[PDB]
């Protein structure tokens, strides 16, 4: 369907899949670009992972005797994005970002040149030397991106809470008082015990729009299909705030309160027909 001639007898066949889960609050909008180059002994599939992962930030009362003045805020300490395969006929040959990146904006490029030559740059706009290129772009204010796992069969990134701008200066993501505030009075409302939306950055208030790449490599002549899974999700922390009329607001953190709240989708690539299917 979408075929681009990239020079020197090579082409890129472009496929997409959009898979969402209202249960997990995730949309996977994935691009799968097959590199078809007679001068490269392997097939290659550039997978660009975009979409949305809801923050799932929420605020609630804590029920039970003794918890009448205790409220909770559930919020994402880390966003999880990963692609894994167990198929012996496929391996991961590059990934972007390749290293830890702490800047608010992340913008990088993967280039391809005929003959099986990949190159990555941690910037967008550098040189018109590639036969084909694909970029990633995302914003992660107050968060940092780390490569949690990387090997020939899997890659996992974590976009993790780091440092926040707060009325009392910068606060570490591990500060138990992060997002905690005194409510106006004793008149309920769990929401009032925590920083208002205007103090919460987009990754806390709304969610994250991922933009990550990995390239799958397949020996030409090995089996026609491979399966792999893409996982998008979050790890949530809980901050509890308890109002003590005489000693003020007391805060506690349950770190890694809900881990790997992820939506996993299994895809099948057919290297012979240059097609992608969702298995479930």
């Amino acid at each position: 369907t979408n075929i681009e001639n990239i020079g020197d007898g090579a082409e890129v066949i472009k496929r997409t899949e959009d898979v969402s889960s209202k249960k997990w609050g995730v949309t996977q909008n994935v691009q799968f670009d097959f590199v078809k180059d007679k001068k490269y002994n392997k097939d290659a599939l550039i997978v660009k992972m975009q979409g949305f992962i809801n923050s799932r930030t929420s605020f609630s009362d804590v029920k039970g005797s003794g918890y009448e003045l205790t409220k909770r805020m559930i919020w994402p300490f880390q966003y999880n994005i990963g692609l894994t395969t167990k198929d012996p006929n496929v391996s991961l040959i590059n990934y972007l970002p390749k290293n830890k990146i702490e800047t608010t904006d992340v913008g990088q490029t993967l280039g391809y040149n005929i003959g099986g030559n990949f190159q990555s740059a941690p910037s967008i706009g550098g040189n018109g030397s590639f036969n084909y290129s694909k970029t990633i772009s995302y914003t992660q204010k107050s968060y940092v991106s780390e490569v949690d796992k990387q090997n020939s069969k899997s890659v996992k990134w974590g976009v993790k809470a780091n440092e926040f701008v707060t009325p009392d200066g910068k606060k570490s993501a591990h500060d138990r008082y992060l997002f905690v505030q005194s409510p106006n009075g004793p008149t309920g409302s769990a929401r009032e015990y925590f920083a208002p939306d205007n103090q919460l950055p987009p990754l806390v208030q709304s969610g994250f729009n991922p933009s990550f790449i990995t390239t799958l490599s397949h020996e030409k002549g090995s089996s026609d299909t491979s399966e792999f899974e893409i996982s998008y999700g979050r790890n949530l922390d809980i901050t509890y705030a308890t109002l003590f009329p005489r000693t003020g607001i007391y805060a506690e953190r349950k770190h890694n309160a809900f881990v790997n709240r992820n939506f996993v989708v299994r895809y099948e690539v057919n290297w012979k027909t240059h097609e992608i299917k969702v298995k479930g």
């Binding site: 209202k22 249960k23 609050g25 799932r56 929420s58 609630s60 559930i74 809900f258 709240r261």
Partner: peptide, 10 residues
């Protein structure tokens, strides 16, 4: 339906 099983404990 637009939430996980148990809804975080709600």
């Amino acid at each position: 339906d637009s939430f996980p099983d148990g809804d975080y404990g709600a």
